Write a protein that binds this ligand. Sequence first.
Ligand SMILES: CCC(CC)[C@H](NC(C)=O)[C@@H]1[C@H](O)[C@@H](C(=O)O)C[C@H]1NC(=N)N
Length: 349
Amino acid sequence: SLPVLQKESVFQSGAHAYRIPALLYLPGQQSLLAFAEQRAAELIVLRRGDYDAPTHQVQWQAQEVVAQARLDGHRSMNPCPLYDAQTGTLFLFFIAIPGRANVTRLCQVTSTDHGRTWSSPRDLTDAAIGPAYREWSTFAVGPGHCLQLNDRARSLVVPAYAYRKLHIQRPIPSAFCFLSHDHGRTWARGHFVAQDTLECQVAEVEQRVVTLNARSHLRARVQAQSTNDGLDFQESQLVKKLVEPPPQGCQGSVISFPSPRAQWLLYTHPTHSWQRADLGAYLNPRPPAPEAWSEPVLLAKGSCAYSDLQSMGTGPDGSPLFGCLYEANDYEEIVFLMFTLKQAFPAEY
Ligand SMILES: CCC(CC)[C@H](NC(C)=O)[C@@H]1[C@H](O)[C@@H](C(=O)O)C[C@H]1NC(=N)N
């Protein structure tokens, strides 16, 4: 299908299994960081990748284990990378569940050497959630990259969802954002969006809004936008243009990038309505506008699942360079795709 700069496998089954990928680009470093769950949900691993423009290809180093990203007697999962341009610090957020009552933990480990080494995990659970904790059974972050805003305080936005016990029934899940306006010092919990929303990610648009796209039991993605930097999500509706597979849907990813014409959205997710196959790439020139969403362009044929996008700057063709990470061939491996806006949306460049 679609010709791309590079298509390679960064993780593969054998010794252990790997799922739930997360991608992070380090602008002033030309580098990328591929995160994932190393399953015997056990530990989180990481692979550093140095991108070279001339050879149109990224060079991946050895695989490593974020030793710090874990709590004793707790499995880890849902790695959510995020980079603070302001301080140049790195944040890897995750979840720790022990080996009806909530026992989930929110944790973060930071790096100041571009992810070469990490700190001690900070358990943000009690200060970040508060009394509402007991009101849930479980929650989670990402999985995937998080967001930093363009507001005064260059706030940090972490996408998440909680499994609300609102009743005589199961628990209902709703997405929300963990906000910090002091570079991961303090954390607050923004409000929820429509019910029955799950794994999600956010991106900033053009005055300034936060578009949040979430997984859903239904047959179409659920999309909500915010005007108060993620605190609230006024609008919120089904985007029939973005199919969602049968079971309980599947995780997608979305990022923003500068329009060649103020940003546009790129989104990745399986295109098959009846399964997790044929990973497409949808483009939105008039974000957030739900009907502005284009048809998808086939990125990879066959079985596909969780994915994560990353804007990588300028491609060798002059167009926006993108970095994709997705689960393939029935979780047998994880692939790193790299292409440009040109190759994907030739009519749009
Ligand atoms: C129970 C809530 C689910 C998310 C909608 C569930 N996530 C967690 C943290 O348990 C995911 C889901 O069951 C699996 C999938 O859809 O592929 C992956 C699975 N995620 C992980 N094993 N990390």
